[PDB]
Design a protein around this ligand. Structure first.
Ligand SMILES: [Zn+2]
Ligand SMILES: [Zn+2]
Length: 230
């Protein structure tokens, strides 16, 4: 019963319960001639909520805040964008206007600024080298190395063993390597194995786009990325 694009009308958001106090969020957007779904995370942070990633644009993001208040009813206080593309930072201006403090690595902030994308307000220290990990309330943030982008982060919720892979991780039904315009195809395989090694206890794995799975998504991602390289 995971929401798909055919079930989501233009500008609307669905929420999907992943575990106690962990939801994904799902919306759709026009991109490169097609309609794409994409995912984000919501994690209970004591009496508040922590948001991971926008819902891909200002409209979608506004709809996301309203859907949260309707379904959950605890305030969104902080948001983390896991890389610089619009499916992760587009809507940051709406979040800021809503009283949400926005965060990203310095590398993500640099790259977003240079692209003309929206720019999270605050810098996350402690993530600049591959294998670096920091706590951020109810989650761990991990920089596995360049892959889908050079700045890509992954997120682990240790209380639920949920691994959120963002666009560095592909869903099973994806056969290509996605948008590789800003990708490091050479390094991706190493970054993926670094994720496998750091999170062997993961039960749910959520890709940047499409259906959740388990640890198999990481091996699938490795395969798909190799297939592209010839
Ligand atoms: Zn991206
Ligand atoms: Zn993406």
């Amino acid at each position: 019963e995971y929401p798909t694009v055919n079930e989501i009308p233009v500008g609307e958001v669905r929420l999907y319960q992943i575990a106690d106090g962990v939801w994904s969020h799902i919306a759709t957007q026009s991109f490169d001639g097609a309609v794409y779904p994409s995912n984000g995370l919501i994690v209970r942070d004591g009496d508040e909520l922590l948001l991971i990633d926008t819902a891909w644009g200002a409209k979608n993001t506004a709809a996301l805040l309203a859907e949260i208040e309707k379904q959950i009813g605890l305030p969104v206080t902080r948001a983390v964008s896991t890389h610089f593309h619009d499916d992760r930072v587009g809507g940051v201006d709406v979040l800021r206007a809503a009283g949400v403090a926005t965060y990203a690595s310095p590398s993500t902030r640099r790259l977003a600024e240079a692209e003309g994308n929206e720019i999270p307000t605050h810098s996350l220290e402690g993530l600049s080298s591959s294998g670096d990990a920091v706590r951020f309330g109810p989650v761990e943030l991990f920089y596995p190395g360049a892959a889908h982008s050079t700045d890509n982060l992954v997120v682990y919720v240790p209380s639920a063993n949920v691994l959120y892979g963002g666009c560095a991780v592909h869903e099973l039904s994806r056969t290509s390597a996605g948008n590789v315009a800003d990708a490091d195809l050479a390094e991706w395989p190493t970054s993926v194995e670094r994720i496998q090694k750091h999170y062997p206890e993961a039960e749910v794995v959520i890709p940047g786009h499409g259906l959740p799975g388990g640890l198999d998504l990481l091996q699938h991602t490795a395969n798909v990325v190799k297939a592209h390289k010839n």
